[PDB]
A paper describes a structure:
Integral membrane proteins belonging to the multidrug and toxic compound extrusion (MATE) family contribute to multidrug resistance by using either the Na+ or H+ electrochemical gradient to extrude drugs across cell membranes. MATE proteins identified thus far can be separated into the NorM, DinF and eukaryotic subfamilies based on amino-acid sequence similarity. Those crystal structures revealed a similar protein fold comprising 12 membrane-spanning segments (TM1-TM12), they nevertheless suggested different arrangement of cation- and substrate-binding sites between the NorM and DinF proteins, hinting at substantial mechanistic diversity among the MATE transporters.
Residue numbers in the entry: 3 to 448
């Protein structure tokens, strides 16, 4: 029991979404610029050698942040199921008792910096040029580690409460920084990769600072305590609980895209990695829409399961779905009428826009069914019974995917790239359908 600050606890709920969503929308989008507007730099004061350094370097940042991420979500979906179901103090407790396993690992990374770095780095596509670039990319971030975790944690918890607004600003602001901060090193000085890393730490420093305020200084939205508050909850079990399927979902993609990246180092030493790199943030970029809408329910379908207005959550979960679908068909078409002009960033051969958009064609007559397929994820995860979300993640990500690529690549062709996907996802979607008529209780309304 606590003081629900201006937790928008007030059930104003389909503008709860409206208002809740867009902030996501916003900062999500923003930082995505920083990528873009960062990397276009690394493609300058360095070439395409480092652009890949970066990209081989990438999955190892993901391996840390994944861990934090569970941690973050773990908290999110605890802390939501514990307001509404109004244990407002259990909350307080949790927040910090995460901060713990955080500050534990914020060291594990700092250690592994001075340790496991090169070891794993060299461990696959080690082009003696890019080898250093990834190294000089990766060393700082780990020094490093700390600011990094806190802030995705905080930004997850601050959603998990309600401050999508100050979220925005956990985003908007390393963002703007890390531009001018890059410019400052990268091109401004000459500390290239080596230094656009140190930029993107001095980013995560000067947030961390600010997050403390929205948890210490006029500690806003809610229960937020600092002296002995936390130690080592038996709730650590309770968050990992939740996070369990969360940090699979990364380690899944992540630990499978080390593969497809270093396997793209044996053929295309570099030419091709910064076209992995490239074709990603147009997946993610126009994933946002979806993602953002998701993160609106994150905590909405949080304080209404609790013990609260069940009646008013099926409302969410319907709308949840309802909207995502229209942006499902959306992305989809705009991902199949404009797959030309976005292959005009890819302007090369008249066979580049041939099979180069052959894949980019019916590879994605799946998109439109991805809307649900991904909403169903929050509403097993805000609702801290991620045991079916577990079940669910492993379906999409591995157990149907790889076994489908592998069962096409065992001689079936670069069609083994195609079918392997469009048809994988459908099964995940059909599965997901079943996981909801599984619970005539998320949606116990239509
Ligand atoms: C925007 O440009 C960049 C910014 C930061 C980084 C560093 C990568 N770090 C591991 C940051 C965490 C990855 C991050 C992304 N994208 C991310 C976190 C969790 C996710 O799970 C839904 C996620 O989706 C795969 C992405 C966010 C939180 C920054 C790379 C960037 O591009 C190479």
């Amino acid at each position: 029991q606590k003081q629900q600050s201006e937790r928008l606890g007030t059930e104003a709920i389909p503008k709860l979404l409206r208002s809740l969503s867009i902030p996501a929308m916003i900062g999500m989008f923003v930082m995505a610029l920083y990528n873009v507007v960062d990397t276009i730099f690394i493609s300058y004061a360095v070439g395409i050698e480092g652009v890949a350094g970066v990209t081989i370097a990438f999955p190892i940042m993901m391996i840390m942040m994944s861990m934090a991420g569970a941690l973050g979500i773990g908290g999110a979906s605890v802390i939501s199921r514990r307001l509404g179901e109004r244990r407002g103090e259990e909350a307080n407790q949790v927040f910090g008792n995460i901060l713990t396993v955080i500050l534990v690992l914020s060291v594990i990374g700092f250690i592994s910096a001075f340790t496991l770095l090169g070891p794993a780095l060299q461990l696959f596509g080690a082009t003696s040029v890019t080898q250093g670039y990834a190294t000089d990319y990766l060393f700082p971030i780990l020094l490093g580690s700390i600011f990094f975790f806190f802030a995705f944690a905080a930004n997850n918890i601050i959603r998990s409460e309600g401050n999508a607004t100050f979220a925005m600003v956990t985003m908007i602001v390393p963002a703007v920084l890390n531009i001018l901060l890059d410019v400052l090193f990268i091109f401004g000085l000459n500390m290239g990769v080596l230094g656009a890393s140190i930029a993107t730490v001095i980013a995560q420093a000067s947030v961390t600072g600010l997050v403390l305020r929205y948890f210490l200084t006029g500690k806003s939205t809610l229960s937020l305590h600092w002296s002995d508050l936390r130690m080592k909850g038996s709730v650590i079990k309770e968050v990992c609980l939740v996070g369990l399927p969360a940090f699979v979902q990364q380690s899944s993609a992540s630990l499978m895209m080390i593969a497809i990246n270093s396997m793209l180092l044996r053929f295309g030493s570099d030419f091709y990695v910064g076209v992995f790199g490239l074709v990603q943030r147009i997946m993610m970029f126009v994933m946002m829409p979806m993602m953002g809408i998701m993160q609106a329910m994150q905590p909405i379908v949080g304080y209404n399961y609790g013990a609260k207005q069940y009646s008013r959550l099926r409302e969410t979960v319907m709308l949840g779905f309802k909207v995502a679908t229209i942006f499902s068909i959306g992305i989809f078409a705009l991902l199949m009428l404009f797959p030309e002009a976005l292959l005009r960033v890819f302007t090369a051969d008249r066979e580049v826009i041939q099979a180069g958009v052959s894949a980019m064609h019916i590879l994605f007559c799946v998109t439109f069914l991805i809307g649900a397929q991904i909403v169903a994820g929050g509403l097993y995860q805000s609702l801290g019974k991620p045991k079916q979300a577990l079940i669910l993640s492993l379906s999409r990500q591995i157990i149907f995917l790889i076994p489908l690529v592998l069962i096409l690549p065992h001689i079936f062709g670069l069609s083994g790239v195609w079918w392997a996907f469009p048809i994988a996802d459908v099964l995940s979607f059909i599965l997901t359908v079943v996981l909801l008529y599984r619970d005539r209780n998320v949606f116990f309304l239509k």
